[PDB]
């Protein structure tokens, strides 16, 4: 058995986690009250991956909810699936960080971190064989970024063996919602690249582009973005819960996607996306899934993959299909797009297949890319960071909470080392 | 300032003498040859290093390199190069049970004193001898370990916590909150050194009865001051001596490790592989560059991949003069491992360092400007221009 | 429990507080008598929010207000007015003469012997409060008790409480319009206190509000009631984040984090976009783009200063009603593509965004039209110095001949206070001029590879 | 681990391995070369006879012969099951020439370290194409040696046939088998090493092959499995070897391996070992003079 402990920090993390739990409960046929009303027998085969069984044949998610503002907690409780969660796991305080990373990491979060770690320890010790943790939050925010980094560091100290995943929403070129996004993003990226095994980069701009262009939604909201992120989250972990012709664990993905320890930032994607009213025209098949997979516009990280090279990608398909077809399609993608893959990793495409598709789709698939183009995002943040650190634009609010210019300087230096690392394998021509 | 490379072959132990007892290392001048017992017909491949030590036969005088000889040949001029002011580094290398601690630490209870004690004796003897009214000296010491990607202090009293690693923007990586203590007598630094050695984590394995479970760095900082009120200044020169004892690479089948021992060996192997990658690079980079002549493109050596290489960033390259000492196990069974060490040892010769003394530009700029004024004045007055 | 304390000082502050408390009572459904028929009709709820009103066992709700003034008349109107039962019986009135447009009289002579009583109630409220968020101080420059007493109260509050945010709402003298001769002296004198102790000061000008009322609202003859209602709407939009749910909620600490690059530049302007009459409510879409564009128009600013003469240091938009992030993102991009709106190069982001679901309410008998969407903008810019410069000029014209100084020095002050205040204001203006300068011309030293 | 411990415990008993080798082109993991090259010590020291099958070869066989445009792992597994059943049918059912595992291994491993024969199955044909073809003994015997029908992506014409063993099932008479072997020896495209004048081993079993319900293979009276030790397999090993070097130059993906107790140098040792097996398959070819 391999079970995951889920943690949610910040407003964005809490919203995405609520939608994700809704999606998972629908997939496993769990009612909002916790009872089971499914049809297939495979739903309860691996329910313990994400749930704990209670006395009255109920199932409680293994979620841990964290924030420094009661408003988000009240929003989750006053919702369609508010009653599913264990009330004792609602760990929260007051006087939130207020978009200040120093408050989230050092001043305010340092007190609630003990309670959150106590709940994490209690939940983890009850597992039969823990697999890893997954944390959902936003890097450009306040309490979310700071306390997420703090919890990641503490848990990594506590449980070095287990795999760590993170679903991070990061700033954007155009879509800006807070003024101090570069500071929080820089410090969060420092802590993340230090102390994680996997990190899926999400962007609001890319999700809005997918909504407007692919899904043709006239009025997208945060619900649709959370829906897309939840679909990706379910796709990543589909293989642990259901049987397949070729299984794939999170550890296997980490081994096959991380060539060097510091390169663990990923570009997620999902297929199919049809917009409704065009499903009748489109023919669903593995070539169509792959073509939508490798399209530049389908990525959620707001990076053009054609501005770099793919270090390594992984496709996880769900639904009945032929292995010859998927292997051939991956080969054609590699051969035709010969200039977008590194020449020193032959067959840098991982393939996994599962026989249990989503509830309403005959076939589905998810994509995890690791390419050099992600450097752009970091570079962009670095530029903005410099534009405020040269003059100390908003610095005092941090230094009043127990910080110093040295910490910012080393964070920026670490980001520069990261972007140089990524840039090394972009130019072609090298070796035997 | 190229990295000096020295190699040393040790005598047999209980494990090899119980099993087959045929040596495979030949040594002559500045050349060391390793033969393949499995392929005796093949060429006896040989490698050239600066300094080669044959400690096989202790009582005999036929090319026997005692610890006094080793220190006089490497630690003496490394200590000299510290005396001008360059930051100097020594670091040990090889496979497990090869004799890295024996080369660096040695046995404190006998005349066979390692590199660190005899560098200490030479330092203290010289500073006591050369003390003057104006000339004066200060010495400060520290000693830390890397156990499993965690920095711990050994001279400090019992502190269960782990020290943090920071990056000063100008001075590079360093360790925060390190219990760095002073010294005024040889006996005091001997006591600190004994305490640090006792604090080190050591466990027994099949390959070695007392195996190092952690990397360690002994760090002296040595300040020379001029107490001349007329012209000179205090803290006129500073040097940093960094003596590094690395843990050896291990094989699970031969070591027989289980549980915590296996995890420790795995972490040590990860750190050693990262260091090898840095070495190959450092070497490889110089190689490429000189090989042709130039073209920019300094690429990037993965220094952040491990704490070991990160802390030793300035010692592996840049502002330091560094010496590698490699330990060889003479037994045939270790042959492949020995070859690997020698191979990486060869790459360690190609690394070039950009060593600078240090001085103090805040005052050395003033001194240089005054000297330039004096030179120009003397030239003008001698030629009748002024 | 996001609980704040509203302090009102002086006649202007008291009338503003009357308008504001009318607005909050209408918003939360609390009747004047203080009771709440909404809960009785429904059965219960959190509409009796702790943010402004404290509940007692009898179902009565009392505001967390502290009205202060030296004239009996202005608050004796309140005690005999419609809202007599709403407030606590204590109202903190000095049965004595007024400060007489004299900073020294309001700060040194008569401000004492009342500051104790006032601070004691400001405690009985703080102790009753839990998780206090901040103070909202309402007053006006140019007045005696509106300058001296507020200065003393802010000094004592900084000494006692310290770390709590202290937002300031105040009325600055207009360039042309005035209602007293000694306004420059009081306004310059209080500048030290509003610079050192206040954490963020929102400033309004009566001429700008009159212009907005004349043009947008088609009110040819406005009075103080309409201006007070506009300021009340501003404050309601500011505080609506910590009362009602929303997609993006902005607390006071985030205001301080975003709108204050440095400690001494905490003087942002404010504006309200959909100021429009009922007759003109039709023939308009009032979309997010329209209100966002209207926020940046020079004519709609609530202080008589031109943003085009300076650069924007920071901006914070608070939207209310049917707003979804696609339109605010598009509007922000559209504003960023315009040339007339200049931003400091050292603040590339330059925008804080908050969205709330609760739409604005309409005061019965008012003049604002009912709308589906609204936005309140706060804007920290360098144009404000111009206004200060004008004020500074007036002060010299009255200080060259020491006119009206014998009144001030006869209550405790000396000329050194005047000189210190003028020098402090000059230093503040110099800081505003310096920070608005671009970043160092690209320090492109053109180092060729390695040194 | 299991092969090592079985060799220590039992030792003398025969140990047959059936494995799926990495393909030249398609694969479902990026670290396949590392595992494949590290398994060389297992497959060479302890296994007495190791058979290797390539997924692309079986895909092409299914596409061309069985007319399955979209095969999956079920068909590949069924073909492998048919191969193993053909191998082991002698131990179960009576026959004219029964081939035991000991004599099977004796005549297929000329030397200890060349125990890596290819496998192929002749009567792979669909129900529709089962008609219109006699499927006589000569047809299947010729079909075994076709490069198109091989189960590994390696051309036999690029090497030499060291040894061969034909196991027939069903209505087969020795006369037809002898005639087919003579016809194959007459052909010149099939080259045999000079030091093996006999070359062919023959076994016959009376039990015909069975047809799984819901399967794809047609019902055939006759069948044969050809198991051939040849030097062409070296090429199939060299391609993979190249990949390993291209992944080992920069030490890609090595930290995962060395973080679980494994030493870095084991990669190079395995590489030198596989280098040896290749040279030996090269040396054993060169004809005598
Ligand atoms: C005509 C038809 O077949 O109906 C589809 C549909 O029209 C389309 C357009 C659906 C539809 O999705 C959307 O409209 C949508 C909007 C914003 C963000 C994401 C989706 C659909 O709503 C979504 C819904 O999807 C599911 O049921 C999946 O199992 C999905 N479930 C949920 O997201 C979910 C919804 C409510 C509660 C709990 C879960 C899922 C996907 C991956 C992993 C787990 C679950 C389906 C069948 C449809 C509708 C209903 C129109 C699409 O969604 C997916 C991922 O299935 C959007 O493009 C796909 C492809 C479909 O053709
Ligand atoms: N917007 C607005 N401004 C007002 C109102 N009442 C007074 N003011 C302003 O207040 C200024 C005069 O100073 P005040 O603060 O009223 O003086 P005070 O509060 O009575 O204090 P004293 O002068 O000591 O009696 C004038 O310039 C007015 O513009 C009002 O109801 N609304
Ligand atoms: N020339 C020598 N003469 C006598 N004993 C020696 C000699 N060289 C090494 N030894 C002994 O060999 C043993 C192993 O040496 P040691 O230096 O402790 O291994 P190591 O370098 O620390 N490898 P590690 O296990 O990673 O710490 C010690 O007991 C030494 O005293
Ligand atoms: N996709 C998505 N993003 C969100 C949502 N809510 C907030 N965000 C993003 O989160 C960022 C603000 O961070 P925030 O959650 O307030 O930080 P926190 O206060 O520490 O939790 C903004 O840039 C938003 O784009 C949501 O529901 N969905
Ligand atoms: Mg040692
Ligand atoms: Mg008055």
Short note summarizing the structure:
Chain A is of the alpha/beta class and 432 residues long.
Which tags fit this structure?
part of a larger assembly, 4 chains, A: 432 residues, alpha/beta, Rossmann fold, 60s Ribosomal Protein L30, Chain: A, Helix Hairpins, 3 domains, ten-stranded mixed sheet, two-stranded antiparallel sheet, 12 strands, B: 386 residues, nine-stranded mixed sheet, 11 helices, globular, binds taxol, binds guanosine-5'-triphosphate, binds phosphoaminophosphonic acid-adenylate ester, binds guanosine-5'-diphosphate, isopeptide bond (chain D), cytoskeleton (chain D), EC 3.6.5.- (chain D), cytoplasm (chain D), phosphoprotein (chain D)
Strand content of chain C: 5-15%
Distance between the termini of chain B: 43 Å
| Structural class based on helices, strands and sheet pairing of chain B | alpha/beta
Overall geometry of chain C: globular
Stated plainly, the CATH topology of the largest domain in chain C is called Rossmann fold
Total number of β-strand segments of chain B? 16
Put simply, the count of helices of chain C is 17
Shape of chain B: globular
Query: If strands are numbered along the chain, what order do they take across the biggest sheet of chain C?
Result: 4-1-5-6-7
Annotated CATH architecture of the largest domain in chain C: 3-Layer(aba) Sandwich
Biggest interface, residues from each chain? A-C, 34 and 34 residues
Family (chain B): Belongs to the TRAFAC class myosin-kinesin ATPase superfamily. Kinesin family. Unc-104 subfamily.
Subcellular location (chain B): Cytoplasm, Cytoskeleton; Cell projection, Neuron projection; Cell projection, Axon; Cytoplasm, Perinuclear region
Binding site for Mg(2+) (chain B): 101
Coiled coil (chain B): 363-380
């Amino acid at each position: 058995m391999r079970e995951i402990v889920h943690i949610q920090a910040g407003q964005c993390g809490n919203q995405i986690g609520a939608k994700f739990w809704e999606v998972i409960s629908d997939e496993h046929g769990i009612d909002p009250t916790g009872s089971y009303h499914g049809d297939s027998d495979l739903q309860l085969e691996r329910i313990n991956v994400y749930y704990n069984e209670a006395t009255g044949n109920k199932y409680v998610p293994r979620a841990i909810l964290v924030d420094l503002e009661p408003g988000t907690m009240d929003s989750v409780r006053s919702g369609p699936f508010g009653q599913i969660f264990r009330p004792d796991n609602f760990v929260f305080g007051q006087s939130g960080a207020g978009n200040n990373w120093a408050k989230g990491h050092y001043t305010e979060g340092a007190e609630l971190v003990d309670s959150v770690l106590d709940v994490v320890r209690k939940e983890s010790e009850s597992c039969d064989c823990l697999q890893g943790f997954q944390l959902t939050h936003s890097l450009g925010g306040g309490t979310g970024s700071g306390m997420g980094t703090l919890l990641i560091s503490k848990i990594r100290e506590e449980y070095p063996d287990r795999i760590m995943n993170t679903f991070s929403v990061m700033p954007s070129p155009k879509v800006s919602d807070t003024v101090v996004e570069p500071y929080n993003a820089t410090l969060s990226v420092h802590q993340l690249v230090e102390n994680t095994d996997e990190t899926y980069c999400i962007d609001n701009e890319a999700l809005y582009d997918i909504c407007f262009r692919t899904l043709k939604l006239t009025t997208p909201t945060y619900g649709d973005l959370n829906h897309l992120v939840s679909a990706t989250m379910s796709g990543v972990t589909t293989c642990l819960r259901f049987p397949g012709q070729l299984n794939a664990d999170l550890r296997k993905l980490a081994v096959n996607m991380v060539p060097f320890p510091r390169l663990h930032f990923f570009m997620p994607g999902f297929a199919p996306l049809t917009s409704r009213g065009s499903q009748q025209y489109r023919a669903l098949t593995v070539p169509e899934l792959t073509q939508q997979m490798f399209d530049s516009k389908n990525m959620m990280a707001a990076c053009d993959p054609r501005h770099g090279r793919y270090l390594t990608v992984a496709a996880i398909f769900r639904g009945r299909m032929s292995m010859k077809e998927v292997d051939e399609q991956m080969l054609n993608v590699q051969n035709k797009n010969s200039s977008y893959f590194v020449e020193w990793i032959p067959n840098n495409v991982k393939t996994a297949v599962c026989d249990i598709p989503p509830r309403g789709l005959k076939m589905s698939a998810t994509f995890i890319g690791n390419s050099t183009a992600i450097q752009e995002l970091f570079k962009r943040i670095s530029e903005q960071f410099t534009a405020m650190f040269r003059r100390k634009a908003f610095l005092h609010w941090y230094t009043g909470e127990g910080m110093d210019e040295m910490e910012f300087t080393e964070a920026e230096s670490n980001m520069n080392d990261l972007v140089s690392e990524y840039q090394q394998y972009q130019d072609a021509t090298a070796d035997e | 300032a190229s990295v000096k490379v020295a190699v040393r072959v040790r005598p047999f132990n209980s494990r090899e003498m119980s099993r087959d007892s045929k040596c495979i290392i030949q040594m002559s001048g500045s050349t060391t040859t390793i033969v393949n017992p499995k392929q005796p017909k093949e060429t006896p491949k040989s490698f050239s290093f600066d300094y080669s030590y044959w400690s096989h036969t202790s009582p005999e005088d036929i090319n026997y390199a005692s610890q006094k000889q080793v220190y006089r040949d490497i630690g003496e001029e490394m200590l000299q190069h510290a005396f001008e002011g360059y930051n100097v580094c020594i670091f040990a290398y090889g496979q497990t049970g090869a004799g890295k601690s024996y080369t660096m630490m040695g046995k404190q209870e006998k005349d066979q004193q390692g590199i660190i004690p005899q560098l200490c004796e030479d330092l203290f003897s010289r500073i006591n001898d050369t003390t003057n009214d104006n000339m004066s000296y200060s010495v400060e010491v520290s000693y830390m370990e890397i156990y499993c990607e965690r920095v711990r202090d050994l001279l400090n009293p019992k502190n269960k916590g782990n020290l943090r690693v920071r990056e000063h923007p100008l001075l590079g990586p360093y360790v925060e909150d390190l219990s760095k203590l002073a010294v005024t007598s040889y006996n005091d630094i001997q006591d600190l050194m004994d305490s640090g050695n006792k604090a080190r984590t050591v466990a027994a394995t099949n390959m070695n009865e007392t195996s190092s479970r952690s990397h360690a760095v002994f760090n002296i900082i040595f300040t020379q001051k001029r107490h001349d009120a007329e012209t000179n200044i205090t803290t006129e020169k500073v040097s940093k001596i960094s003596l590094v004892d690395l843990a050896g690479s291990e094989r699970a089948d031969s070591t027989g490790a289980k549980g915590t021992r296996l995890k420790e060996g795995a972490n040590i192997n990860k750190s050693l592989t990262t260091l090898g990658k840095v070495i190959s690079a450092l070497a490889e980079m110089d190689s490429g560059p000189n090989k042709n002549k130039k073209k920019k493109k300094t690429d990037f050596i993965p220094y952040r991949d491990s704490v070991l290489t990160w802390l030793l960033r300035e010692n592996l390259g840049g502002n330091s003069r560094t010496a590698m000492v490699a330990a060889l196990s003479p037994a045939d069974i270790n042959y492949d491992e020995t070859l690997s060490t020698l191979r990486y040892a060869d790459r360690a010769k190609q690394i070039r360092c950009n060593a600078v003394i240090n001085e103090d530009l805040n005052n050395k700029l003033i001194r240089e400007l005054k000297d330039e004024v004096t030179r120009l004045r003397d030239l003008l007055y001698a030629q009748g221009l002024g | 429990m996001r609980e704040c304390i509203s302090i009102h000082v002086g006649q202007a502050g008291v009338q503003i507080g009357n308008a504001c408390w009318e607005l909050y009572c209408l918003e939360h459904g609390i009747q004047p008598d203080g009771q709440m028929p909404s809960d009785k009709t429904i059965g219960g709820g959190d509409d009796s929010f702790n943010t402004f009103f404290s509940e007692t066992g009898a179902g009565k709700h009392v505001p967390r207000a502290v009205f202060v003034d030296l004239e009996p008349t202005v608050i004796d109107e309140v005690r005999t007015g419609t809202y007599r039962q709403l407030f606590h019986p204590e109202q903190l009135i000095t049965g004595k003469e007024d400060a007489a447009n004299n900073y020294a009289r309001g700060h040194y002579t008569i401000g004492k012997e009342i500051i104790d009583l006032v601070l004691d109630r400001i405690r009985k409220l703080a102790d009753q409060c839990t998780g206090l968020q901040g103070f909202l101080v309402f007053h006006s420059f140019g007045g005696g008790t509106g300058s001296g007493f507020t200065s003393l109260l802010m000094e004592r509050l900084s000494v006692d409480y310290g770390k709590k945010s202290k937002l300031e709402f105040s009325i600055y003298p207009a360039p042309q319009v005035s209602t007293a001769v000694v306004e420059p002296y009081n306004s310059i004198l209080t500048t030290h206190t509003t610079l050192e102790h206040s954490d963020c000061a929102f400033m309004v000008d009566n001429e700008a509000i009159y212009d907005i009322c004349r043009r947008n609202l088609d009110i040819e003859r406005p009075t103080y009631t309409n201006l007070n209602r506009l300021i009340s709407q501003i404050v309601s939009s500011i505080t609506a984040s910590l009362r009602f749910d929303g997609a993006l909620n902005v607390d006071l600490t985030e205001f301080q984090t975003n709108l204050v690059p440095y400690p001494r530049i905490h003087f942002p302007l404010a504006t309200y976009a959909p100021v429009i009459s009922a007759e003109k409510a039709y023939h308009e879409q009032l979309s997010v783009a329209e209100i966002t564009n209207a926020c940046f128009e020079p004519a709609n600013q609530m202080v008589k200063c031109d943003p085009r003469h300076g650069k924007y240091m920071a901006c914070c938009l608070l939207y209310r009603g049917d707003v979804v992030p696609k339109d605010v993102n598009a509007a922000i991009a559209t504003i960023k593509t315009k040339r007339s709106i200049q931003f400091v190069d050292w603040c590339p982001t330059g925008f804080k965004v908050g969205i709330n679901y609760q739409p604005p309410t309409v005061v019965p008998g008012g003049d604002l039209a009912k709308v589906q969407r609204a936005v309140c903008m706060l804007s920290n810019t360098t144009a404000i110095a111009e206004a200060w410069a004008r004020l500074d000029h007036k002060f010299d014209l009255m200080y060259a001949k020491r006119a009206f100084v014998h009144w001030y020095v006869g209550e405790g002050m000396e000329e050194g206070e005047f000189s210190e205040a003028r020098e402090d204001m000059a230093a503040l203006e110099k800081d505003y001029e310096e920070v608005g300068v671009d970043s160092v011309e690209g320090e492109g030293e053109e180092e060729g590879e390695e040194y």
